[PDB]
Amino acid sequence: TIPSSITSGSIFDLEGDNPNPLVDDSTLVFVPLEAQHITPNGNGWRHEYKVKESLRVAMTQTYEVFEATVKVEMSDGGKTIISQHHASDTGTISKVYVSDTDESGFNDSVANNGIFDVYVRLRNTSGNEEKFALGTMTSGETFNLRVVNNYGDVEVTAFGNSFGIPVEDDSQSYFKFGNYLQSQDPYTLDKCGEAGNSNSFKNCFEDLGITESKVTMTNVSYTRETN
Ligand SMILES: [Ca+2]
């Protein structure tokens, strides 16, 4: 069953109220094309859970483990962030992607061919992102995701591949997970749409041919200890 920290809101706040991700006691379904949740600075639509403001502390002050069995069904060319450590500012600290773009450096890296790269970017102590390819998948396939924050040393494992480094600390950091669909051309990597304008993203996803984007998470666990 889905942990109560999620289902009850004791730890996580929901972004995108409808539909609710809990489709049965053991399954989370994140569908940003339906939830269509936005923020002032966002660059797409999201359906996502986030650690609530009151519990946030420095990356170096918690031990967190998130694990999930993740199935992804998404139109060719789609790109989403399915888990991330977010900074206090607009920064990010860790991001895990499922992505069908021409961005170089991954196992596929071929735009719009239905083969999604699964990779991670981790922001190091110098403030620079390091990226690492974990695997590839086609729509409908499933993989295992494990994200660990060991007091500032962040590790991601998927498809049996692991990568981790110490990350730039942020005093009010927070973990999020779900399906944050990115409004971006997969060929050119140009962003599409206008911040805060939900209709703009509507039109972007139509033009990008993104008519399916469903992240299903099962066998989910989350632990959090603070120091
Ligand atoms: Ca591809």
Strand partners of residue 122? 94, 130
Query: Residues 39, 42, 43, 49: is their CA dihedral positive or negative?
Result: negative
Q: How do beta strands 174-182 and 79-86 pair?
A: antiparallel
Closest CA to 21 of 46, 47, 1: 47
For residue 158, give the CATH number of its domain.
2.60.120.200
Residues after which the chain is broken (C–N above 2.5 A) are none
**Tokens for 186?**
């997969």
Gap from CA of 80 to ligand 1 centroid (Å): 13
Q: How far is the CA of 73 from the centre of ligand 1 (A)?
A: 14
For residue 70, give its domain range. Answer: 1-227
Q: How far is the CA of 163 from the centre of ligand 1 (A)?
A: 21
For residue 89, how far is its CA from the centre of ligand 1 (angstroms)?
31
Domain count within the chain: 1
Cα 160 to middle of ligand 1, angstroms: 20
**Are residues 150 and 63 in contact, defined by beta-carbon separation less than 8 angstroms?**
yes
Q: Experimental method used, please?
A: X-ray
Residue 111 Cα to ligand 1 middle (Å): 5
Closest CA to 41 of 148, 177, 195: 195
Residue 86 backbone zone (phi > 0: left; psi -120 to 50: alpha; other: beta)? beta
CA distance 147 to 96: 9
Residue with tokens 């060929």: 187
Please, are residues 79 and 186 in contact by the beta-carbon 8 Å criterion? yes
Distance 130 CA to ligand 1 centre (A): 20
Measured in Å, residue 77 CA sits from the centre of ligand 1 at: 7
- Locate 12 and state its tokens: 């996580």
Ligand 1 centre distance from Cα of residue 211 (Å):
17
Ligand 1 centroid from CA 118, angstroms? 10
Q: Degrees (nearest 5) of the Cα angle 221, 39, 218?
A: 20
How many Å lie between the centroid of ligand 1 and the Cα of residue 191? 18
Q: Resolution limit in angstroms?
A: 1.6
Question: Residue 100 Cα, ligand 1 centroid: separation in angstroms?
Answer: 4
- Identity of residue 216: T
